[PDB]
Design an enzyme around this catalytic site. Structure first.
Site, PDB file in Angstrom:
ATOM      1  N   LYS B  10       1.408  -1.516   0.304  1.00 28.02           N
ATOM      2  CA  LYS B  10      -0.305   0.000   0.411  1.00 28.02           C
ATOM      3  C   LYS B  10       0.929   1.594  -0.253  1.00 28.02           C
ATOM      4  CE  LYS B  10      -1.835   1.582   3.576  1.00 28.02           C
ATOM      5  NZ  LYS B  10      -0.610   2.825   4.001  1.00 28.02           N
ATOM      6  N   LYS B  15       7.855   0.715   0.358  1.00 30.80           N
ATOM      7  CA  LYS B  15       8.653  -0.011  -0.786  1.00 30.80           C
ATOM      8  C   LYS B  15       9.101   1.487  -1.479  1.00 30.80           C
ATOM      9  CE  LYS B  15       4.467   0.342  -3.103  1.00 30.80           C
ATOM     10  NZ  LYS B  15       3.890   1.631  -1.874  1.00 30.80           N
ATOM     11  N   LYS B  41       3.885   8.694  -7.800  1.00 27.52           N
ATOM     12  CA  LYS B  41       4.786   9.739  -6.956  1.00 27.52           C
ATOM     13  C   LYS B  41       6.573   9.566  -7.995  1.00 27.52           C
ATOM     14  CE  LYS B  41       5.139  10.379  -2.190  1.00 27.52           C
ATOM     15  NZ  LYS B  41       6.852   9.951  -1.491  1.00 27.52           N
ATOM     16  N   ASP B 129      -2.326  -0.644  -3.837  1.00 29.94           N
ATOM     17  CA  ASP B 129      -3.362  -0.334  -3.443  1.00 29.94           C
ATOM     18  C   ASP B 129      -4.659  -1.056  -4.554  1.00 29.94           C
ATOM     19  OD1 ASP B 129      -2.228   1.767  -0.977  1.00 29.94           O
ATOM     20  OD2 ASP B 129      -1.211   2.572  -3.571  1.00 29.94           O
TER      21      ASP B 129
HETATM   22  N1  ADP Z   1      11.928   1.345   8.361  1.00 31.68           N
HETATM   23  C1  ADP Z   1      11.957   3.231   7.797  1.00 31.68           C
HETATM   24  N2  ADP Z   1      12.094   3.697   9.463  1.00 31.68           N
HETATM   25  C2  ADP Z   1      11.763   4.973   9.259  1.00 31.68           C
HETATM   26  N3  ADP Z   1      11.373   5.482   8.343  1.00 31.68           N
HETATM   27  C3  ADP Z   1      10.845   5.062   7.309  1.00 31.68           C
HETATM   28  C4  ADP Z   1      10.904   3.499   7.005  1.00 31.68           C
HETATM   29  N4  ADP Z   1      10.500   3.216   5.952  1.00 31.68           N
HETATM   30  C5  ADP Z   1       9.848   4.156   5.459  1.00 31.68           C
HETATM   31  N5  ADP Z   1      10.212   5.304   6.380  1.00 31.68           N
HETATM   32  C6  ADP Z   1       9.771   6.722   5.834  1.00 31.68           C
HETATM   33  O1  ADP Z   1       8.429   6.361   5.073  1.00 31.68           O
HETATM   34  C7  ADP Z   1       7.759   7.691   4.500  1.00 31.68           C
HETATM   35  C8  ADP Z   1       7.650   6.260   3.386  1.00 31.68           C
HETATM   36  O2  ADP Z   1       8.200   5.813   2.999  1.00 31.68           O
HETATM   37  P1  ADP Z   1       8.601   5.219   1.112  1.00 31.68           P
HETATM   38  O3  ADP Z   1       8.858   4.128   1.133  1.00 31.68           O
HETATM   39  O4  ADP Z   1       8.090   6.309   0.578  1.00 31.68           O
HETATM   40  O5  ADP Z   1       6.874   4.808   0.673  1.00 31.68           O
HETATM   41  P2  ADP Z   1       6.095   4.215   0.006  1.00 31.68           P
HETATM   42  O6  ADP Z   1       6.912   4.406  -1.621  1.00 31.68           O
HETATM   43  O7  ADP Z   1       5.531   2.749  -0.465  1.00 31.68           O
HETATM   44  O8  ADP Z   1       4.948   4.893  -0.989  1.00 31.68           O
HETATM   45  C9  ADP Z   1       9.329   7.709   4.381  1.00 31.68           C
HETATM   46  O9  ADP Z   1       9.694   8.834   4.639  1.00 31.68           O
HETATM   47  C10 ADP Z   1      10.215   6.832   4.681  1.00 31.68           C
HETATM   48  O10 ADP Z   1      11.298   8.000   4.686  1.00 31.68           O
HETATM   49 MG    MG Z   2       7.558   4.839  -3.463  1.00 29.44          MG
END
Ligand code: ADP
Ligand code: MG
Ligand code: ADP
Ligand code: SF4
Ligand code: SF4
Ligand code: MG
Lengths: 273, 273
Positions: B10, B15, B41, B129
Site C-alpha cells: 500500500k 516500498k 509518485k 492499492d
Molecule cells: N524503516 C523505516 N524507518 C523510518 N522511516 C521509514 C522507514 N521506512 C520508510 N520510512 C519513511 O516512510 C515514508 C514512506 O516510505 P516510502 O518508501 O516512500 O513509501 P512508499 O514508496 O511505499 O509510498 C518515507 O518518509 C520514508 O522515509
Molecule cells: Mg514509493
C-alpha cells in the site's frame, strides 16, 4: 435541497471511520443522510449497520441477473439514526478496473430514485490513492459538489490530497465540484495541526477539523459501532460532533491551487515533522 | 540469468525506501541491479541518483515525439554502486488510467535491450492499492517472477498484501509469477513481528525480514541518500544488508493462499494489535 459530499484520501488514513462517525453525529442532530461506499474494501457502512460489512451492488446484481433486476428497497439498508447505506463493490484483484463498480452503483442509485427530496446529505467514501476510472467519476461527472480530504502529517497523505486537488482543477470547466476542506486525522505528532493548516492555506481551502488519535475508536469498532453510538459521552464523540457542526456550517468551496513537490517538502521541513 | 523481482504494498508503507536500500546493499555486495519505478509518485530512484526525482519515460517520450524516438542510453541513469534507474511516470490525476505508463515503460525497456546478460536483479517498485491496469501488468504479463510485499501490522497494509496475493493466484495458470515473502516495515508496535509471521504462514509464504523503524532513514533521505551510502556503520544499514542476503538466498516462491477478512480480523485480535 441536499448536499452531495465526498470523502477522499489515501488508503488507511481514516476515511471510513471519520465518515461514519461524522454521519452518526449528523443523524444525532436530526439530519437524514445516505452513505455510498466507493472503496473496494467495502466496509464503509459496517459501523452504521452493526455488521461485518454489507453485500455490494456488484454482488447483488450478479445474483439477481442484471443490475436492472435489483430493487432499491432491497439494496439500501438503514442503521444507526436511520442512516441509509449502500456499497458499490468492485471486481476482484487482477480483473478489469478496480473502480468500475462505482459507476454502476451511482448510476443505479440515480435511476432508481434514491436521491429523495427528504435527504439532507449524501456522503461518498472514495478510494483516493489513484484518481482514475470510477474513483474519478464523482468528480468527473459532477456527483459530489463538496470534497473533504482526510489526511495527516504523513507525506503520502499530503501527496494524495494534492493529487485529488489536481483532479478537481482538471474538471472545473463544467459542473460544480469544489474542495471544501482538509480533515487532519492525527498521528499524534508535534505541530501536525499547524502543518495541515499551512497545507490547506497553500491549496486555498481550510483545515475544517483536527481529529485526535484516540483508542476509543478501536474499542467502538471491535463492537461494530461508531463512537457516537458506543459511548456518546466520550471526548472523541464530541470531536466528531464538532466536525459535523463545521461541515453543516461550511460555506468555503474553492477551486484549489495544487502545489509542487518542492512546496510539500518545504512544509514538512518547516514544521519539523 | 537475472532475477526479476517486484516490490508491492500500500501507499506510504515503505516500498521505495526499502527497495532502494535493499538494492544499495546488493550493489555493495557486487550485484548489478536495475530499478524500474512503477508508481506515479515517481520518486523510486531519487536516493540512488542523489536527486529530487527522475524524469519519467512518459515525460521524455512527450518531449521527443514518440517513445520510439527515445534512446535507452538517454533514459537509464546510473547512481550509487552503478545501480541503473528508470521511472515509468503516468497520466495526471483525473486523466486516463493511472497505470498506463507502466505498460509503456516495461515494453520500451524490453524492446530496447535493457535486460542485458550482466544484470543480476531487476526490481519493479509498484503501487499496490489497486491491482489493475498497468499496476497488474507485472503479474498479468509475467514480468516479475518474485513478488515481495512490504506491509506492517496495520490492517490496511495486510489487506493490500492479501489483495496482491489474490492477483498472483488469478494469473497462476500461465507464466511463473510467485509470492516470495512479506517484509514487515515496523510501526514500533508490540508483537508486530509475530503478527506478520502468522499472516505469512496463512498465505503460505514467510516473513523474509523485519525492518525496524529508525529515524536514520529520515536523516539519510533529507540528504537524498540510502542509509547504506549515508552511514554504512548504522544499525539500520546492517538491517538492509540482512534483508538483501535473505533475498539473495531465498528459494521459497509459492502460489499463495489468500485469506478471508474474518481471518485478518482474527490475526489482529490474537496479537493484541
Ligand atoms: N524503516 C523505516 N524507518 C523510518 N522511516 C521509514 C522507514 N521506512 C520508510 N520510512 C519513511 O516512510 C515514508 C514512506 O516510505 P516510502 O518508501 O516512500 O513509501 P512508499 O514508496 O511505499 O509510498 C518515507 O518518509 C520514508 O522515509
Ligand atoms: Mg514509493
Ligand atoms: N481518530 C482515530 N483514532 C484512532 N484510530 C483511528 C482513528 N481514525 C481511524 N482509526 C483507525 O485507523 C484504521 C483505518 O481507518 P479507516 O477509516 O478504515 O481508513 P480508510 O477508510 O481511509 O482506509 C482503522 O483501524 C480505524 O479504526
Ligand atoms: S489504475 Fe485501475 S484500471 Fe486504471
Ligand atoms: S482503477 Fe485506475 S483507470 Fe481503473
Ligand atoms: Mg475505508
Amino acid at each position: 435541497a441536499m448536499r452531495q459530499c465526498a470523502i477522499y484520501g489515501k488508503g488507511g488514513i481514516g476515511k471510513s471511520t471519520t465518515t461514519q462517525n461524522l454521519v452518526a453525529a449528523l443523524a444525532e442532530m436530526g439530519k437524514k443522510v445516505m452513505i455510498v461506499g466507493c472503496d473496494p474494501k467495502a466496509d464503509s457502512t459496517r459501523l452504521i449497520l452493526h455488521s461485518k460489512a454489507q453485500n455490494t451492488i456488484m454482488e447483488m446484481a450478479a445474483e439477481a441477473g442484471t443490475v436492472e433486476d435489483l430493487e432499491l428497497e432491497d439494496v439500501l439498508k438503514a442503521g444507526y439514526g436511520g442512516v441509509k447505506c449502500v456499497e458499490s463493490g468492485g471486481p476482484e484483484p487482477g480483473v478489469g478496473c478496480a473502480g468500475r463498480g462505482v459507476i454502476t452503483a451511482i448510476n443505479f442509485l440515480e435511476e432508481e430514485g434514491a436521491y429523495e427530496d427528504d435527504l439532507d446529505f449524501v456522503f461518498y467514501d472514495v478510494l483516493g490513492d489513484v484518481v482514475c476510472g470510477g474513483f474519478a467519476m464523482p468528480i468527473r461527472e459532477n456527483k459530489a459538489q463538496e470534497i473533504y480530504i482526510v489526511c495527516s502529517g504523513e507525506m503520502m497523505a499530503m501527496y494524495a490530497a494534492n493529487n485529488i486537488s489536481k483532479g478537481i482543477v482538471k474538471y472545473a470547466n463544467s459542473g460544480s465540484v469544489r474542495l471544501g476542506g482538509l480533515i487532519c486525522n492525527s498521528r499524534n505528532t508535534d505541530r501536525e495541526d499547524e502543518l495541515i493548516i499551512a497545507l490547506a492555506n497553500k491549496l486555498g481551502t481550510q483545515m475544517i477539523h483536527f481529529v485526535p488519535r484516540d483508542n476509543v475508536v478501536q474499542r467502538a469498532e471491535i463492537r461494530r459501532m461508531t463512537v457516537i453510538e458506543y459511548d456518546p459521552k466520550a471526548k472523541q464523540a464530541d470531536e466528531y460532533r464538532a466536525l459535523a457542526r463545521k461541515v453543516v456550517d461550511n460555506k468555503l468551496l474553492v477551486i484549489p491551487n495544487p502545489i509542487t513537490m518542492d512546496e510539500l517538502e518545504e512544509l514538512l521541513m518547516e514544521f519539523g515533522i
